[PDB]
Amino acid sequence: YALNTLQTALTTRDSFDPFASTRTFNLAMTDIGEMYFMPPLMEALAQRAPHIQISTLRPNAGNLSEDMESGAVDLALGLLPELQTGFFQRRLFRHRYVCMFRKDHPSAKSPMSLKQFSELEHVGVVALNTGHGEVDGLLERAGIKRRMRLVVPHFIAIGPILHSTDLIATVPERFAVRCEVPFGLTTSPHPAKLPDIAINLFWHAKYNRDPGNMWLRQLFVELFSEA
Amino acid sequence: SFDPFASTRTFNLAMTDIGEMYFMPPLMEALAQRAPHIQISTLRPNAGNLKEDMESGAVDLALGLLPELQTGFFQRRLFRHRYVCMFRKDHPSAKSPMSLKQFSELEHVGVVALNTGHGEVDGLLERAGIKRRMRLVVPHFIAIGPILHSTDLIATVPQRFAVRCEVPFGLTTSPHPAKLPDIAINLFWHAKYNRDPGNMWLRQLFVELFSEAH
Amino acid sequence: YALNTLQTALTTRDSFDPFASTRTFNLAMTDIGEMYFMPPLMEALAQRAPHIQISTLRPNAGNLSEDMESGAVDLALGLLPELQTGFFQRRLFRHRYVCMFRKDHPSAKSPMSLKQFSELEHVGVVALNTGHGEVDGLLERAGIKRRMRLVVPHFIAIGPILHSTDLIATVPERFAVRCEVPFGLTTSPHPAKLPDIAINLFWHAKYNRDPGNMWLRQLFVELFSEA
Amino acid sequence: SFDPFASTRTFNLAMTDIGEMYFMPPLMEALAQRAPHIQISTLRPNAGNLKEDMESGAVDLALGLLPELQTGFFQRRLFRHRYVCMFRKDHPSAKSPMSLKQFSELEHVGVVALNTGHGEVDGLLERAGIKRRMRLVVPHFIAIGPILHSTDLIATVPQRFAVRCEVPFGLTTSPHPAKLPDIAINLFWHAKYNRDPGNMWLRQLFVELFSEAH
């Protein structure tokens, strides 16, 4: 603790010029994260730091905690409960779950009732080891019966699937927003009581005062923080 | 015997994220009318052990390149797709067909796509001396559509991914200026299930909707 | 399947006279279940079947599935997702979660805000391997910070604790109802979005047509079913 | 050293359900003013391995009868409580002090309370020839208060449980007509933590609020 903090503060830190910097920042995030964060982020970086490189990865890949300590991963986004001691953290926003289907669905309504929700057919996404993976069990434990026509491991094909079928889906609202116009889809408030999931920004304490890290962090907070 | 309109069976299909985006929408549309009570579920080829799960009937069919699947597996060509180059339709400079000169001047989103046919792309472009300004690297394909919509980035991408993205994200494609090989996409099943009537029927459905032989 | 169903229907079944029956029914249920079900149940049985014996047990005790097959446990109540094939089932109601504290609390309000909820101190109950055990993680995953003054494994002492302190608790609403008057406590709607939990009545298929089982079942449905 | 008013420490106390209901309300009331920033957490003696968890500091103190805790543990008597007999105050016939004759005529809720001092009760009443009409048997004590409130059942119950239930559930007690032994309730700690200042302080708090020596 002590000999580490005093060492991380006595070393000369690498200055950061956003206009000139050529450095690569590595960020951890889920697929929903990638699709939500990267478009506005890359748009902003085009005007603010034109020569940096961004590279993303999923939290499960590599060893996240240790990669963050060594500087190999600069930031992490999501829920990530395993990041505690050694890690600073800051809530960006709360995902609220919502209900999605195609705009010309023959029966689906907004606001959808719990009764209709349970009559209709569904595409589910497993989303293993993320907070969205908890959704199927939350619904099962509320005794909300679901005709599960299709289950997929991840979110990539949800938009296209809902476009061509009468299936409905339970998705984070920021996913639905990135999907409504492109695939011709509406949402409804979720008729089940689903809990929100907090999305946080995490950095290791070694880089709490690194100027480049501080600069990217504050960007994330600037673009994505609702607080 | 196997009756599509009454069957209540669960089929378990292994495919990549491109596979899922490409096969599933038209497949589910077909099933709405042909097998209203079956259940489909997908998984990635790297999830679990694919060979063993297919021998045991946990996984009914696999879609993709999949050179590992040799002995004990039948396979049937479904299509080849080329790599294509993608960008937003109102890109300030990008043109179709795009030149190698422009390709190398412009900024890119790469996707790593590890343990997949699409993961060879970066290596093949390096070895051909094709330099690339890699602004953004991502592991998978989910975010490419929206990223391209909101930036002046360009992506190298399988043609059938581009088919699912062009209209939705307001994008255009160009034939790829680099000499990239085509990717064969095959339907796979274990020998044990070669004559299983339910397998046969779904196999035949995939051929019908996705085979470009004829 | 087939040789079992035809065997369980060709055997003469034991008649049931509620007024005369002297038989012991064994029911599985959680502590919250015991406190909610047993008082009204025993009250009803005093007038309907005065000579039967009831005995309860927790689902984790013994081997529940196998004990139900053999007739050693007659019924089970709760969520119990492990009971599927071989088991009939019927939803009694849905637990909605609620917020509890003493009626003369200096600061607590109804309806409590999410902000106050997170300012105040809490008693938590772990409730391992039940749906109520999921609550702490649901709140953690919504980024709802909680000053956890006290944690207890089970619900027994919640009423008394809330009576003598300024702690608040997150409890099923039927628990709160069995507690409000006795311990001088109010509730508030929960400011967090918590999912309901379904409470079901389960019986094995061997006893689907046993008259005694059928009789107790229909009693549970009669007293406790909100549908 | 150890400073109550600033300490931010977590103490982990093993006790039964009666223990929890009895000790925790007055303990938490005392701490509100004496140690506003500590954290308490409880568990049952059967949960985990108690001996090993106390040696390692996972569990700071244990409250109860606990004859297993011999070598490596100090202990201090806190109180003895008698068994008592409980029923609703407007019971149609039940009287205090209750006779053995009435006790055996009336209907009962028993609690098994396995692996606990209170679990000996059923056996002791059988061996004394005291017959009992056991209408309801439950494993634990949670539901007894409400059950007694809504029925004409009677329960044999530790006196300190009855102390927590009498007024809330509108109940009365009688000294028990059977010859049941008292239950000693002791405070326990591992030898290793005999001079740990934080342990010492909480130990002393328990003695202050719960010791009936003086």
PDB file of N, CA, C and O in Angstrom, chain A residues 37 42 56 59 67 75 117 124 147 151 178 204-205:
ATOM      1  N   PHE A  37     -20.692   2.836 -26.730  1.00  0.00           N
ATOM      2  CA  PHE A  37     -19.618   3.807 -26.503  1.00  0.00           C
ATOM      3  C   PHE A  37     -18.836   4.210 -27.774  1.00  0.00           C
ATOM      4  O   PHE A  37     -18.582   5.388 -27.978  1.00  0.00           O
ATOM      5  N   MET A  42     -15.440   7.617 -30.931  1.00  0.00           N
ATOM      6  CA  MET A  42     -14.612   7.788 -32.121  1.00  0.00           C
ATOM      7  C   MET A  42     -14.945   9.091 -32.848  1.00  0.00           C
ATOM      8  O   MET A  42     -14.055   9.786 -33.305  1.00  0.00           O
ATOM      9  N   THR A  56     -10.228  -2.089 -28.280  1.00  0.00           N
ATOM     10  CA  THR A  56     -11.083  -2.636 -27.235  1.00  0.00           C
ATOM     11  C   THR A  56     -10.875  -4.126 -27.045  1.00  0.00           C
ATOM     12  O   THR A  56     -10.271  -4.801 -27.862  1.00  0.00           O
ATOM     13  N   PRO A  59     -14.009  -8.035 -21.192  1.00  0.00           N
ATOM     14  CA  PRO A  59     -13.431  -8.232 -19.851  1.00  0.00           C
ATOM     15  C   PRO A  59     -12.898  -9.648 -19.566  1.00  0.00           C
ATOM     16  O   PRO A  59     -11.816  -9.782 -19.000  1.00  0.00           O
ATOM     17  N   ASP A  67      -3.836  -7.092 -16.025  1.00  0.00           N
ATOM     18  CA  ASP A  67      -3.599  -6.252 -17.199  1.00  0.00           C
ATOM     19  C   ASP A  67      -3.826  -4.760 -16.888  1.00  0.00           C
ATOM     20  O   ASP A  67      -3.126  -3.903 -17.412  1.00  0.00           O
ATOM     21  N   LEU A  75      -8.530   1.323 -19.240  1.00  0.00           N
ATOM     22  CA  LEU A  75      -9.843   1.610 -18.663  1.00  0.00           C
ATOM     23  C   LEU A  75     -10.712   0.393 -18.865  1.00  0.00           C
ATOM     24  O   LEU A  75     -10.411  -0.471 -19.694  1.00  0.00           O
ATOM     25  N   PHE A 117     -46.958  -9.834 -23.158  1.00  0.00           N
ATOM     26  CA  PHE A 117     -45.562 -10.215 -23.084  1.00  0.00           C
ATOM     27  C   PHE A 117     -45.422 -11.722 -23.025  1.00  0.00           C
ATOM     28  O   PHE A 117     -44.607 -12.302 -23.725  1.00  0.00           O
ATOM     29  N   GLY A 124     -34.190 -14.577 -26.894  1.00  0.00           N
ATOM     30  CA  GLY A 124     -33.450 -14.265 -25.693  1.00  0.00           C
ATOM     31  C   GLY A 124     -31.968 -14.206 -25.969  1.00  0.00           C
ATOM     32  O   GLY A 124     -31.464 -14.855 -26.890  1.00  0.00           O
ATOM     33  N   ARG A 147     -42.405 -17.969 -23.995  1.00  0.00           N
ATOM     34  CA  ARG A 147     -42.231 -18.830 -25.168  1.00  0.00           C
ATOM     35  C   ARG A 147     -40.903 -18.485 -25.875  1.00  0.00           C
ATOM     36  O   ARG A 147     -40.844 -17.564 -26.681  1.00  0.00           O
ATOM     37  N   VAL A 151     -32.896 -18.455 -28.852  1.00  0.00           N
ATOM     38  CA  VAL A 151     -31.937 -17.986 -27.887  1.00  0.00           C
ATOM     39  C   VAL A 151     -30.627 -17.845 -28.636  1.00  0.00           C
ATOM     40  O   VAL A 151     -30.249 -18.733 -29.397  1.00  0.00           O
ATOM     41  N   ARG A 178     -29.780   2.594 -30.236  1.00  0.00           N
ATOM     42  CA  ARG A 178     -28.831   2.336 -31.322  1.00  0.00           C
ATOM     43  C   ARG A 178     -29.395   1.394 -32.418  1.00  0.00           C
ATOM     44  O   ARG A 178     -28.679   1.069 -33.378  1.00  0.00           O
ATOM     45  N   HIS A 204      -7.230   1.672 -12.624  1.00  0.00           N
ATOM     46  CA  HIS A 204      -6.346   1.311 -11.530  1.00  0.00           C
ATOM     47  C   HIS A 204      -5.749   2.549 -10.867  1.00  0.00           C
ATOM     48  O   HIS A 204      -5.694   3.623 -11.474  1.00  0.00           O
ATOM     49  N   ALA A 205      -5.295   2.391  -9.624  1.00  0.00           N
ATOM     50  CA  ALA A 205      -4.809   3.525  -8.838  1.00  0.00           C
ATOM     51  C   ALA A 205      -3.440   4.004  -9.319  1.00  0.00           C
ATOM     52  O   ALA A 205      -3.133   5.173  -9.188  1.00  0.00           O
TER      53      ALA A 205
END
